[PDB]
Amino acid sequence: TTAKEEMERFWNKNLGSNRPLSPHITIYRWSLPMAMSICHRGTGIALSAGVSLFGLSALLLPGNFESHLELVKSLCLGPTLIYTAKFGIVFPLMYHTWNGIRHLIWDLGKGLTIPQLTQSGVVVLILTVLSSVGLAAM
Amino acid sequence: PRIKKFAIYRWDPDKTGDKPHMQTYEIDLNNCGPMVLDALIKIKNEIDSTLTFRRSCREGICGSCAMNINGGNTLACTRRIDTNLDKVSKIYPLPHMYVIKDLVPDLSNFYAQYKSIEPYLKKKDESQEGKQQYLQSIEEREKLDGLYECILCACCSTSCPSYWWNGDKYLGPAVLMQAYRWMIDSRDDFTEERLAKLQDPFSLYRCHTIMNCTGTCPKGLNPGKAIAEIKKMMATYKE
Amino acid sequence: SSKAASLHWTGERVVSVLLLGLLPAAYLNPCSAMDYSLAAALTLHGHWGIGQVVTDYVRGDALQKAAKAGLLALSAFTFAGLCYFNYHDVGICKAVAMLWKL
Amino acid sequence: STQYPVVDHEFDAVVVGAGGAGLRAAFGLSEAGFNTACVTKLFPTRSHTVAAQGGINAALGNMEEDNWRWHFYDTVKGSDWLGDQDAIHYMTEQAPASVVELENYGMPFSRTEDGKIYQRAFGGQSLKFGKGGQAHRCCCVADRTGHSLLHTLYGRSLRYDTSYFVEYFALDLLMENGECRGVIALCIEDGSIHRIRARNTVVATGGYGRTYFSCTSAHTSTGDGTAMVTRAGLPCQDLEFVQFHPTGIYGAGCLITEGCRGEGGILINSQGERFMERYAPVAKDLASRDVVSRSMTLEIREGRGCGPEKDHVYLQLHHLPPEQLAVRLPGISETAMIFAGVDVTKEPIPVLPTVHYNMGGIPTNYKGQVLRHVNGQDQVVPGLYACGEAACASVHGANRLGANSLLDLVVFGRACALSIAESCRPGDKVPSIKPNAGEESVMNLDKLRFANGTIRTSELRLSMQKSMQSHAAVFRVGSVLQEGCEKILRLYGDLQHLKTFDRGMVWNTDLVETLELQNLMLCALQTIYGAEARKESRGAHAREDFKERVDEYDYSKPIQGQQKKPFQEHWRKHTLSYVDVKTGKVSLEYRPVIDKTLNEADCATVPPAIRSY
Ligand SMILES: *Cc1cc2c(cc1C)nc1c(=O)[nH]c(=O)nc-1n2C[C@H](O)[C@H](O)[C@H](O)COP(=O)(O)OP(=O)(O)OC[C@H]1O[C@@H](n2cnc3c(N)ncnc32)[C@H](O)[C@@H]1O
Ligand code: HEM
Ligand SMILES: O=C(Nc1cccc(-c2ccccc2)c1)c1ccccc1C(F)(F)F
Ligand code: SF4
Ligand code: F3S
Ligand code: FES
């Protein structure tokens, strides 16, 4: 019996059986690395959705970009509420950017120990908040 | 008397239409060894022998008793019970695995994946074997430390979200580290073709560096690191 | 007996480091030339990224194929929509610049 | 019986055991082109031999100049002249070839300056036939030499079309008219019953350490092949010989390697005095396991204990360089800290002599063929082989040498393969078995599965373990041994009374552990009765009544003109034990040790002498 034959039989056995899947996301220990892997996907997705919405509306919707901005000025939000929208854009970008660099450092082979993860994790987290406040204020 | 509560996952396939549930046991810790396995053994021997789990060495070097204790995957024989009586130890089988009965997961696929990478020495001219000890320098041998110690407990792969969603086509941290183990054994001659065996989007390239595997390893090993080390060889090996 | 799986992976990191360099590059040097290179680097990286989310979660025969096609369409539509914006409007750079001091 | 699915498998050969010996035998058979099945109640990696730590002996002469014949002398001395020299010749000659075979397989042996396999000093070994000081021939993968041995043998095992019946509990031998036909087994996975038949059958089921309350051995060390051979009416050998390893941890009784001592580790009593200098002057704490442990046990007797309750002794390590402990003993460094909260680099480990090895087992040829005893003579059981710890070629005798069982495994596993390959052919007539063979195994299985009695399986196991522990320990006396016997027999009477709870088919551990209990008892009975009958002190068996080593001659004085003692008057002979499965009666006989080697001209016989270290 071969390794390929064993798997093919494993799946034949279990799928046709009344065996239950042991709980996973329901019971496994929450960690910062975990949350940060999740957030990288989330921010990654949100950003592409925003980029594609910007490209698609540029093809599908009428009027130039100024005509679209002049429409935002219409329901003139308070200077702080405009800063909120501005912070809500930069936040996911900055998180994904900094955590992105971390991902890249990893691919070089560097910084892959449990202490280095928790450390570099907080450095990313802190760097997000600072650069997000710092950019929104420009 | 110091009474500690254990909440344990239960399922009996030989019982008509039984569904998975939790059962709680209570143990006097003065009359019980320090490790979780000791409890399991005690509640098995004294309270309930319908409890069914894998175990052998009680030494943390066989890898049989691997399970999910209080969130993380470890070995029950190496994990001491948290003497804090206000907390209740929750014991589950290895996450996202087909449960045979109680805490006994079907590891058939796990081992088959291990087989598919050929965890043995491969020489281009094996017509001289069994007569001369091969020369490996002390420095060439250090390169295998943190790699050979693996016990195949399947804790890491079972703590791995990619191995949950894609356990069929993706080999997982456990098996992958052993592929690496043989890649850098200086005595091996099949290094290029060992890397070519991973040239598809699933076998190796399904890890997105969650590092949750390394954090969980009961033996202190770092499968995560070794995977990223594989990836680098994959991008760089010529011909 | 090609080695595409590893090449593709490298490609991703090459455009990752590219995209990283391109953000400050665009701030310091905002121009037409940056508007397009930013549009290419952005959609490609995004395309490959979502492609990973797809290959991770989309379990299926004719599904895996379909999602990958619908992603390709969305990606292509995006790159054009952006290039249209760079040609016939103020472009990615100046548009952000206007949006910010508002 | 309308309840149990009977599934018949056909093979050339069956190996029962996926340990070190099991595997080498298993894939060795497949390599010779045999359709082989391997039946094992654990996944092969989980088998004890992973717990192995010290090393595997081969006279590779890597550290100094060595000769395999010196290794020969050492083991036979070690064996206390109960070891059959023909087998010891074969093993020690094959030693280097077998160890090289393993390294060539990819076993990650630790290396030296030369780049060769690292060998270390160990208890009981010498150069120049004893006259040349301490020998360095213990080949080792750091502190985890067994783990690696088992994992590479398993790695290799995957190259051949061997059929691995993973997690199948072997119940009995298939026996027809003195000949072996295979094994009947329970498949734990679904409660089904499989009759695997073959021309040749190899038993490699390891030891029975779980007969005692304190052991280094795993929870699965329950002498299952031993019980199977017993239930067939076949004899077992030297079962009273139970190795008490000197350095087992005080807590859970986990093994701490003898390698510790070979690296420079010292044994210390309550007053700090290096007590092993007092017992063995020349060899110190690197003396034989039986001597060291009995010295330890005797140091506790006098009042020199070391705990807050004075019941153990310290193994000191902190004087050795930190980097030496890191590279040589990293695995016990971890388990000393985990189980005893001990930093090896600063504090000593609490160690106590505990049960470890079974030199007794299934009597065997140097070729690995199970021997029965007819008319005071040896006789080969057709189609039945045994190797590893479950066997007894008595390559170990009255006291096993340290780091010789991993060798035992590899050599005799291979030997079993060659004995089959060189006697019969693949695709030869596989002998047809009776339509209802192994019936009583299923009936036995059935009673235990629905066993509604008064004494729980776990409780009786405890009664057996504590009894063997206090009645047949390091030291033993006639009276104490006798109460042990009449106690174990009473506990065998208790077996008809046991309560079992789980009534399921799938993974009935409640059930298997009861099968294990029948297996354990049958092993224990023969251990204790044979122990009581042996009225001499030889190797690990130490009688406080008869402290004398009783041979055919008084080997202390000249051999010249002396009266040779008749066979039933001296004790330099193997104990052969039987038990009537029903009444639980142990009856015993004796067969001579083999003194002649395979070639006097190449390897000279070593006659008995005064044996002290
Ligand atoms: C206990 C111990 C022994 C030991 C050691 C460390 C420890 C903690 N270190 C050693 C060392 O460094 N050097 C050395 O030479 N020896 C050392 N030892 C002793 C040695 O390890 C043992 O004697 C040896 O491991 C015995 O191996 P064996 O080949 O006989 O197989 P096993 O490891 O004992 O495993 C038993 C196999 O048989 C199968 N089995 C058992 N019962 C059944 C039944 N019921 N049905 C089907 N299969 C069965 C098991 O599955 C297992 O595969
Ligand atoms: C322009 C805005 C960006 C968008 C729309 C975007 C989009 C995405 C998406 C959809 C993913 C896939 C998510 C996943 O697989 O988990 C991803 C991953 C990634 N991103 Fe971005 N990203 C952007 C900016 C950046 C920047 C500036 C960097 C540079 C540090 C970066 C580095 C990475 C890396 C290295 C990954 C892959 C990590 C891995 O799974 O191994 N991204 N991105
Ligand atoms: O699904 C992913 N994690 C995931 C998704 C949902 C829940 C959990 C989780 C939550 C708590 C504990 C453990 C795991 C984890 C994930 C996230 C980022 C990148 C790649 C992945 C994956 F590879 F596809 F697996
Ligand atoms: S690397 Fe660690 S968690 Fe993974 S199989 Fe080996 S011991 Fe288990
Ligand atoms: S999903 Fe597993 S492999 Fe390590 S890189 Fe990944 S945690
Ligand atoms: S049972 Fe041996 S690892 Fe826990």
Numbering used by the authors:
A (entry chain C): 6 to 143
B (entry chain B): 9 to 247
C (entry chain D): 35 to 136
D (entry chain A): 10 to 622
Q: What did the original publication write about this model?
A:
Instead of the isopropoxybenzene group of flutolanil, the R2 groups of the flutolanil derivatives 4, 5 and 6 are bulky phenoxy, phenyl and pentafluorophenoxy groups, respectively. The IC50 values of the derivatives 4 and 5 for A. suum QFR and porcine SQR are comparable to or even lower than those of flutolanil, but the derivative 6 inhibits both enzymes less effectively. In order to analyze the decreased effectiveness of the derivative 6, X-ray structural analyses of A. suum QFR and porcine SQR in complexes with the derivatives 5 and 6 were performed. The derivative 5 is bound to both enzymes in a similar manner as flutolanil: the phenyl group is situated in the same site as the flutolanil isopropoxybenzene ring and interacts with hydrophobic residues (A. suum QFR: Leu 60C and Trp 69C; porcine SQR: Ile 30C and Trp 35C).
The enzymes of the fumarate respiration are anchored in the inner mitochondrial membrane where complex I (NADH-rhodoquinone reductase) acts as a proton pump that is driven by the oxidation of NADH to NAD+ and coupled to the reduction of rhodoquinone (RQ) to rhodoquinol (RQH2), while complex II, serving as a RQH2-fumarate reductase (QFR), transfers electrons from RQH2 to fumarate. Since fumarate respiration is the major pathway of energy metabolism during adaptation to a hypoxic environment for many species of parasites including adult A. suum and bacteria inhabiting anaerobic environments as well as some human cancer cells exposed to low nutrition and low oxygen conditions, the pathway is one of the most promising targets of chemotherapy for both parasitic diseases and cancer. In spite of the similarity in amino acid sequences and three-dimensional structures between A. suum QFR and porcine SQR, flutolanil specifically inhibits the enzymatic action of A. suum QFR.
